[PDB]
Design a protein around this nucleic acid. Sequence first.
RNA 1: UUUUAUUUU
Length: 168
Amino acid sequence: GRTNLIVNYLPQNMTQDELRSLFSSIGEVESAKLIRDKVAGHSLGYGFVNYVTAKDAERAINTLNGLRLQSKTIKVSYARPSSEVIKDANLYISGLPRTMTQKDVEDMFSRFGRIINSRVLVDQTTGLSRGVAFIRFDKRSEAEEAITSFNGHKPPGSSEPITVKFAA
RNA sequence: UUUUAUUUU
């Protein structure tokens, strides 16, 4: 069974030692790593926790996924095997009709492959979608297929062409 | 252009 977890949405000032200690409450941790920028040294707000046992990893997901830490809500999920293929697979999308929900956006992009995570940005003044979304695919080839299919194109029921590009 | 930050040799 799987033992290795990726932990996203860590507080900016959380240390590797703090990550390890937090997750050690569940069971015996084989290793924990906080990912930091190579050039300047700041946390990138995500890390990996590898448990000795698969039951502990599973319990950690059920217990700690969604845990509030400072102003963050952490995500705890199984890490996919580390590989070049999974990197840079994150899309920025704009021009979406404001009536599209997160699920609607996911429904629209799911044909291209497995979706890792997604977000539709909301205007906090009005509560309405900004028509801007993020969608990360399992593999960069999947995101590329989405770009070529959708970028510059109007969704059915909308007169507005959308932009689909790699995020950043 | 995200809860700025999803693969650590």
